[PDB]
Amino acid sequence: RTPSLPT
Amino acid sequence: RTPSLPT
Amino acid sequence: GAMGSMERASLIQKAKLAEQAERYEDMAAFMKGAVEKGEELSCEERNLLSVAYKNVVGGQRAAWRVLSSIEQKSNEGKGPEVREYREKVETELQGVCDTVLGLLDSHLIKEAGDAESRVFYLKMKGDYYRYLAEVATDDKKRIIDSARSAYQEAMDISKKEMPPTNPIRLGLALNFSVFHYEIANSPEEAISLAKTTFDEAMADLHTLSEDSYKDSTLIMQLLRDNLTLWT
Amino acid sequence: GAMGSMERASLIQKAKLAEQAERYEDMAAFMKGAVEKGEELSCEERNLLSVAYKNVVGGQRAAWRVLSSIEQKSNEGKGPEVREYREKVETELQGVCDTVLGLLDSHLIKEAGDAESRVFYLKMKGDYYRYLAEVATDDKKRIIDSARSAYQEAMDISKKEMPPTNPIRLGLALNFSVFHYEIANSPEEAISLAKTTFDEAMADLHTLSEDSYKDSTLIMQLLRDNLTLWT
Numbered sequence: 001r002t003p004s005l006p007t
Numbered sequence: 008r009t010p011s012l013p014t
Numbered sequence: 015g016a017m018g019s020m021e022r023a024s025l026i027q028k029a030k031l032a033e034q035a036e037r038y039e040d041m042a043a044f045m046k047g048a049v050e051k052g053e054e055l056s057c058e059e060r061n062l063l064s065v066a067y068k069n070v071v072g073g074q075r076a077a078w079r080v081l082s083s084i085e086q087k088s089n090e091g092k093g094p095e096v097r098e099y100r101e102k103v104e105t106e107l108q109g110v111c112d113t114v115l116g117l118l119d120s121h122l123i124k125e126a127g128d129a130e131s132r133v134f135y136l137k138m139k140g141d142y143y144r145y146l147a148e149v150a151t152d153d154k155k156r157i158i159d160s161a162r163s164a165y166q167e168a169m170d171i172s173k174k175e176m177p178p179t180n181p182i183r184l185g186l187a188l189n190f191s192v193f194h195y196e197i198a199n200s201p202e203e204a205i206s207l208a209k210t211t212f213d214e215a216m217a218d219l220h221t222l223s224e225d226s227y228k229d230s231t232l233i234m235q236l237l238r239d240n241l242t243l244w245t
Numbered sequence: 246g247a248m249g250s251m252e253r254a255s256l257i258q259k260a261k262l263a264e265q266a267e268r269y270e271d272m273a274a275f276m277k278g279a280v281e282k283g284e285e286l287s288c289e290e291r292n293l294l295s296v297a298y299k300n301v302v303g304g305q306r307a308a309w310r311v312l313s314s315i316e317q318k319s320n321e322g323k324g325p326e327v328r329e330y331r332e333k334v335e336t337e338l339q340g341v342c343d344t345v346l347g348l349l350d351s352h353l354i355k356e357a358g359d360a361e362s363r364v365f366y367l368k369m370k371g372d373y374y375r376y377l378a379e380v381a382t383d384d385k386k387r388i389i390d391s392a393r394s395a396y397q398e399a400m401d402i403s404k405k406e407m408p409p410t411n412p413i414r415l416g417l418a419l420n421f422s423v424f425h426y427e428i429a430n431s432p433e434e435a436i437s438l439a440k441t442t443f444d445e446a447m448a449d450l451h452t453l454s455e456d457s458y459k460d461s462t463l464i465m466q467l468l469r470d471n472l473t474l475w476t
Contacts, residue, residue, distance in 0.1 A: 001310075002471055004372075004423045005416040005464065007296060008079075009240055011141075011192045012185040012233065014065060027326045031315065035308035037334070077266035084262065095258045103268070 017047020025051075029062050038069035042110075049117045054125055060134050067114050071145055074107040078149060104149050111142045118142075129175035130182055136168035137186040140193065147197050158197060165190040178214040179222060179230040187211035188237050195244065205244050212237045248278020256282075260293050269300035273341075280348045285356055291365050298345050302376055305338040309380060335380050342373045349373075360406035361413055367399035368417040371424065378428050389428060396421040409445040410453060410461040418442035419468050426475065436475050443468045 017025060025048040032041035045063045049055065055063060081100035088096055118139050126132040143161035150157050169190060172183040187207060195204035215234050219227055248256060256279040263272035276294045280286065286294060312331035319327055349370050357363040374392035381388050400421060403414040418438060426435035446465050450458055 002423050002426055002474060003467065005419045005467060007292075007299065009192050009195055009243060010236065012188045012236060014061075014068065024324070024326050027324075028330050031312060031327065031330050034315070035311040035334070036304075037308050040330075040333075073267075077268050080266040081262060084265070093255070093258075095255050096262065099259050099262050099271075102271075103266070 017043065017050065020047060022048055022051045022053065026059060026062070029066065033062070033065060038066055038073075041066035042070050046113065046117065049122065052121075054131070055122070057130070060131065063117075064134075064138065067110065071107060071110050071114075071142075074103060074110060075145060075148065078103050078107055107149065108146060111146050114142045115139065129171055130180070133168045133172045133176065133182055133186060136164050136171070137182070137189065140165035140168065140186075141189060144189075144193050144197055161193055161197065165193060177218055177221070178211075179218045179226070181229050181233055184211065184215060184230065184233040184237070188233065188240070191237075191240065195240075201244060205241065208237050208241050208244075212241070248274065248281065251278060253279055253282045253284065257290060257293070260297065264293070264296060269297055269304075272297035273301050277344065277348065280353065283352075285362070286353070288361070291362065294348075295365075295369065298341065302338060302341050302345075302373075305334060305341060306376060306379065309334050309338055338380065339377060342377050345373045346370065360402055361411070364399045364403045364407065364413055364417060367395050367402070368413070368420065371396035371399065371417075372420060375420075375424050375428055392424055392428065396424060408449055408452070409442075410449045410457070412460050412464055415442065415446060415461065415464040415468070419464065419471070422468075422471065426471075432475060436472065439468050439472050439475075443472070 020028075025044045029041050029044040029048065032038070032044060041062070045059075045066045048059065049063065078100065081096065081103055085096045085100050118135050123132070123135045123139065126135050140161050143157055143164060147154065147157045147161055165186070168186050172180070172186055176183045178184075188211070191204045191207040191211070193204075194200040194207060212234055215230060215237075219230065222230060251259075256275045260272050260275040260279065263269070263275060272293070276290075276297045279290065280294065309331065312327065312334055316327045316331050349366050354363070354366045354370065357366050371392050374388055374395060378385065378388045378392055396417070399417050403411070403417055407414045409415075419442070422435045422438040422442070424435075425431040425438060443465055446461060446468075450461065453461060
């Protein structure tokens with residue numbers, strides 16, 4: 001999982 | 008809150 | 015239903031999957047279904063029941079404390095929303111406590127003959143009455159005494175039938191001591207129980223395997239932590 | 246209903262309370278109710294809508310990945326329970342995505358005229374189609390193209406109407422680049438988009454206040470983190 005934008 | 012026993 | 019159509023073994027299998035997925039509401043629903051099959055629970059199955067609902071009501075209690083703090087600050091000369099939402103969370107919490115107490119009464123406790131199953135369930139009963147006591151405002155006194163009574167019966171059995179290092183006995187003692195300190199306004203009883211429990215366990219460690227030693231000392235450390243906090 | 250009888254302002258107030266209490270399912274239900282009042286959402290209210298559902302579907306996706314991993318291991322010559330429960334979580338997840346997509350289509354996007362509201366909602370639409378794509382098995386191609394189309398329209402508007410340091414523009418670019426890398430099998434497009442976005446933001450930092458600088462550079466760091474991961 002490449003991190004997406006939190007919030 | 009005094010900690011109670013986890014689990 | 016809604017778990018009535020699923021096999022008991024499948025409900026247990028899915029409870030373990032739900033635990034891995036940290037889906038505790040699901041886990042609780044699966045374990046409720048398993049209990050409602052009417053057979054007694056194994057040691058591992060009792061643990062699953064505890065884990066599921068403890069996590070569910072744990073979230074609810076944390077939320078309730080947040081909302082209660084805000085409501086308290088709001089007092090001391092807005093609108094009804096804070097109180098409404100705290101009441102919503104409170105009602106949901108009470109519903110979960112009532113559900114667990116219902117399973118224990120229908121019919122887990124009455125069929126539990128072995129000391130460790132009986133003590134396990136009575137300890138649980140004490141806990142869920144304690145959670146009800148945390149939000150109770152004199153219904154409260156009867157609720158508190160129901161918690162006390164359940165803890166006391168569990169203590170009596172555990173002292174007679176289990177070694178002082180038994181993790182179930184230790185965990186019961188730790189929570190009953192927390193009840194004394196946090197609910198019953200009896201800090202001295204809380205401290206006394208914690209210390210005697212810790213000392214009697216210490217004296218029995220020499221009888222234990224390395225793995226049992228690990229299990230017992232972990233809970234003893236939590237007893238000690240509370241004593242350090244209290245004194 | 247079920248939020249139909251509550252004031253719009255009370256729903257917003259309770260969404261903020263639910264966020265403080267980390268009760269994101271409640272928060273989402275409150276925000277759904279607020280949207281269904283039919284008025285446009287403010288900047289802060291859009292953020293609340295995003296926060297609520299992102300946390301809800303975030304939990305579901307995490308659970309789905311756990312169960313999917315277990316199911317995959319189970320293959321490679323037990324019973325149907327793992328697949329059943331993964332399907333249960335999957336269905337629930339899809340339901341949440343469909344709910345959010347429903348709010349966006351009825352009628353948030355069509356009434357959003359300002360660049361930043363329109364881009365915000367289209368970015369959200371792209372995200373929830375992306376979440377649907379993560380579990381899709383050729384319905385999948387149309388789902389992927391729906392995600393792409395929403396992201397693309399948001400990109401076109403954001404490039405024309407917003408500065409390169411705008412956090413909404415930056416966040417859209419970061420997620421569209423993740424879509425390229427994780428969903429569309431286009432790592433080179435992902436890397437290209439991330440780099441151009443980062444460089445164009447860098448060149449515009451000098452125009453910003455200290456607070457705006459802080460906001461923009463935070464998201465730029467996340468772009469950079471992904472580039473480091475990808476190269």
